[PDB]
Amino acid sequence: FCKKSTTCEVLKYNTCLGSPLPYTHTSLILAEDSETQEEAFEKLAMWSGLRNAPRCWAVIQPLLCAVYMPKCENGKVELPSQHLCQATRNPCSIVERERGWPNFLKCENKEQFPKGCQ
Ligand code: NA
Ligand SMILES: [Zn+2]
């Protein structure tokens, strides 16, 4: 329940939004707007507008990477934490005005963002 069972695929990129990754396997099961890694790349660049607000970017960048390019290992993908999600709501509240959060990026989604597994 802190992880989701899935089939891992080899990462086509070694970088998520500037950050080098310490893993080479991923899954697209968490990003409900992407079916391929090439689509996840496109959607990730779409979120890169939040760079102009450092206090938003500091928390939203690790979260988006945990959703779009998460670590897959031994048939399981890791789930992003509820604490990390809630930290984004306030400094990134501009999203609510401009487009709103997708269901897979809402904190009320307890199966996507469970608490405990930090
Ligand atoms: Na998907
Ligand atoms: Zn491998």
Residue numbers in the entry: 41 to 158
What is written in the article reporting this PDB entry?
Although we set-up crystallization trials with the entire zSmo ectodomain (residues 29–212), the N- and C-terminal regions could not be traced due to missing electron density and thus were not included in the final model. The small interface between the two zSmo CRD molecules observed in the asymmetric unit of the crystal (buried surface area of 490 Å2) and a crystal contact formed by a zinc ion bonded to three different protein chains (one chain A and two chain B molecules) suggested that the dimeric arrangement observed in the crystal is not likely to be of functional significance. In agreement with this crystal packing analysis, purified zSmo ectodomain behaved as a monomer in solution at low concentration (5 µM) when assessed using multi angle light scattering. The zSmo CRD monomer adopts a globular fold composed of four α helices (α1: residues Q77-N92; α2: P94-Y108; α3: Q122-N130; α3′: S133-E138) and a short two-stranded β sheet (β1: K43-S45 and β2: K116-E118). Disulfide bridges I, II, III, and IV lock the four helices together into a tight bundle, whereas disulfide bridge *, formed by the N- and C-terminal cysteines, orients the termini in close proximity and away from the helical bundle. Structure-based evolutionary analysis of zSmo CRD revealed that the closest structural relatives are the CRDs of Frizzled 8, secreted Frizzled-related protein 3 and muscle-specific kinase, shown clustered in the blue branch in Figure 5B. To investigate the putative oxysterol binding site in the Smo CRD, we calculated the volumes of potential binding pockets in our zSmo CRD structure. The most prominent groove is indeed located at an equivalent position to the Fz8 palmitoleyl-binding groove. The residues forming this groove are highly conserved in all vertebrate Smo CRDs, and the volume (551 Å3) and shape of the groove is sufficient for 20(S)-OHC binding. Computational docking using AutoDock showed that the hydrophobic groove on the zSmo CRD surface can accommodate 20(S)-OHC with a favorable free energy of binding.
Smo consists of an extracellular N-terminal region containing a cysteine rich domain (CRD), a heptahelical transmembrane segment (7TM) and an intracellular C-terminal tail (C-term). Smo belongs to the G-protein coupled receptor (GPCR) superfamily of proteins, most closely related to the Frizzled (Fz) group of Wnt receptors. In the absence of Hh ligands, Ptch1 inhibits the function of Smo, a 7-pass TM protein that is encoded by a human oncogene. Our work now shows that the Smo CRD in vertebrates binds to oxysterols and mediates the ability of these lipids to activate Hh signaling.
